[PDB]
Design a protein around this nucleic acid. Structure first.
Lengths: 45, 101, 44, 119, 193, 70
RNA sequence: GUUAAUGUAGCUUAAUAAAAGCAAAGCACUGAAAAUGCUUAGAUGGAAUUGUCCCAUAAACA
């Protein structure tokens, strides 16, 4: 089950707010990540 | 009849938490499966953005156990890697002295 | 090696307490010194 | 003037007690037993008993530990045993449920420290 | 005694299935606490980035709806794994079977499994064999034939000649079971997931 | 500071997640048992047919690893 | 129908004087794991008596 480990909470000792963005891959696949800045999407070249 | 060597697993992911969260998760599965884990090391950030990589040590494996284990690892993944591997304390040496004396 | 090792003191304490009650050949300190009702319970 | 075991210096728990109140937390049930030096349980309170569990929502709970403490105290008070020695382990002492159960004994009048033997 | 070897081809799902509502609420909970433990026109740039995601074609989570009846096509399923299943026609009995090719004692089981792909798959896509132990042996007699059911996972999916005249169907678990009518074949699903 | 109702709502969804996860653990544990039993059953099947083949098969492949799969 | 299986909850030859113990899960925690605290889940589909029938189920024969 891929979602078994995907869903987790940040247990790090303090951190800056991370905003959700998608790293769009060249094959059309997408992956959710938490990024420091309030961006929306990222593109892999 | 030959037995597998100790194979380290390098888990590199975009998010430090996700890499570690998978690294701890596999250890839990490893412990349930009776897989010995010597250490869970973390590598430095790949400064250029950065990436986070964690080593999960695995020791002991069998032909049938290998087949099922890696299949489970593939499904469990939400970048996998499998590779063969490459200060003692006072009580440890004291026993060591007697053997060689 | 194969046998598990106690990770908590309590489980060993239960094992230790159980052994004390159990008889041993060597001298030890101790030697010297209906159905329908059950269904009703499930409903409750 | 009754005797107490004054030895077992190297072994814990200490045997210096006329009565010892041992509370055992199982996977699903928590039970409290008062036993004499011989080890016979004079008075026993267990959540597994039908009457308590019918009136008790969840066999294992902090309040369940509180409830059994009060129930055991009443059994102890009616029995006539008012003083016992309880020696929880450091983590067991830290447990809130044991603290809550101990609080029930204090408010119920049960004392967890027995007096020293008089010569 | 006739010698026959079967290869149980396996393909991993490309994309994960959607999260259940109980998973979604937990995702909200971890996000909500994530903000709690966090330490502190951009919208126009954000709008430019979000639309850039839309213009680029994304990989569909499930291609079954689009493919529907494209069983011969390699990527029958994206949510779940695929098992290659190829009709084997014989005079004594003609039944839908798993990819099968003869096996010789001199050739090791893995080598036999490789020949099955080299003799039937005949396509760029590559599979890897983990354990030399077989995953199943099932014998059907009429003449007695024993079939060795090896297993294979797909490294790559560069299928060649998607529309082979040969009746090759990729079925995850359910469509596979229906085809495997004989109980010997039906039991082949014991190790299949 | 979160209100008691807010904690109640978060606690409520926590119960649902815990209940499902335990169900998954039983299902996942049973799945491994079925996977292992089938694989172990497959081991015994060819042993009856021909044990000699296994002597070579049971030996591990040194060249199998390092092997990385996503 | 013949052979053969399978029938307290992952495990137990726990139990017929009272349906138990253990394993297992999650959360808090922070190196990891474990521990600790807070919590979660379940069965006799079953009659024998010790410390085989039985019907059901599902297989080779059929």
């Amino acid at each position: 089950d891929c979602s078994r480990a995907s869903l987790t909470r940040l247990r790090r000792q303090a951190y800056a707010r991370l905003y959700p963005v998608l790293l769009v891959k060249q094959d059309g696949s997408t992956i959710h990540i938490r990024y420091r800045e309030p961006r929306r999407m990222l593109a892999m070249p | 009849d030959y037995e597998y060597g100790v194979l380290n697993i390098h888990l590199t992911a975009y998010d430090m938490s996700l890499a570690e969260s998978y690294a701890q998760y596999v250890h839990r599965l490893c412990n349930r499966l009776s897989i010995k884990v010597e250490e869970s090391y973390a590598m430095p950030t790949k400064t250029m953005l950065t990436t986070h990589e964690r080593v999960v040590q695995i020791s002991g494996l069998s032909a049938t156990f290998a087949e099922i284990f890696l299949e489970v690892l593939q499904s469990n993944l939400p970048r996998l890697s499998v590779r063969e591997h490459t200060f003692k304390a006072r009580p440890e040496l004291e026993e060591l002295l007697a053997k060689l004396n | 090696e194969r046998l598990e090792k106690y990770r908590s003191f309590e489980r060993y304490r239960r094992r230790a307490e159980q052994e004390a009650r159990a008889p041993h050949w060597w001298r030890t300190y101790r030697e010297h010194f209906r159905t329908q009702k059950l269904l009703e319970r499930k409903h409750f | 003037v009754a005797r107490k075991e004054r030895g077992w210096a190297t072994v814990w728990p200490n045997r210096e007690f006329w009565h010892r109140l041992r509370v055992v937390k199982t996977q699903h049930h928590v039970e409290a037993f008062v036993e004499h030096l011989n080890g016979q349980v004079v008075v026993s309170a267990s959540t597994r008993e039908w009457a308590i569990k019918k009136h008790l929502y969840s066999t294992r709970n902090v309040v369940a530990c509180e409830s059994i403490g009060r129930v055991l105290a009443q059994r102890c008070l009616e029995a006539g045993i008012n003083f016992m020695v309880y020696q929880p382990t450091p983590w067991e002492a830290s447990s809130d449920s044991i603290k809550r159960l101990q609080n029930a004994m204090t408010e119920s009048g049960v004392m967890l420290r027995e007096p020293r033997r008089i010569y | 005694w006739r010698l026959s070897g079967a290869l149980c081809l396996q393909r991993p799902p490309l994309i994960t299935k959607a999260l259940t509502p109980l998973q979604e609420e937990m995702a909200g909970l971890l996000q909500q606490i994530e903000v709690e433990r966090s330490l502190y026109l951009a919208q126009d740039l954000e709008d430019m980035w979000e639309q850039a995601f839309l213009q680029f074609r994304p990989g569909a989570r499930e291609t079954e709806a689009d493919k529907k009846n494209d069983r011969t096509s390699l990527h029958r399923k994206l949510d779940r794994n695929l098992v290659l299943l190829v009709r084997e026609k014989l005079g004594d009995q003609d039944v839908w079977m798993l990819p099968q090719v003869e096996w010789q004692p001199g050739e090791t089981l893995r080598g036999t499994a490789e020949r099955i792909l080299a003799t039937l798959s005949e396509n760029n896509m590559e599979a890897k064999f983990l354990g030399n132990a077989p995953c199943g042996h099932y014998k059907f007699k009429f003449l007695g034939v024993k079939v060795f059911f090896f297993k294979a996972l797909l490294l790559t999916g560069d299928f060649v000649q998607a529309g082979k005249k040969s009746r090759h169907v990729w079925a995850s678990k359910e469509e596979l079971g229906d085809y495997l009518q004989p109980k010997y074949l039906a039991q082949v699903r014991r190790f299949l997931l | 500071e979160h209100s008691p109702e807010e904690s109640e709502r978060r606690a409520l969804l926590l119960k649902r997640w815990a209940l499902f996860k335990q169900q998954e653990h039983e299902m996942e544990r049973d799945a491994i048992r079925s996977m292992l039993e089938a694989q172990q059953e497959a081991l015994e099947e060819l042993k009856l047919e021909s044990a000699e083949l296994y002597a070579e098969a049971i030996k591990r492949d040194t060249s199998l690893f390092p092997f990385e799969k996503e």
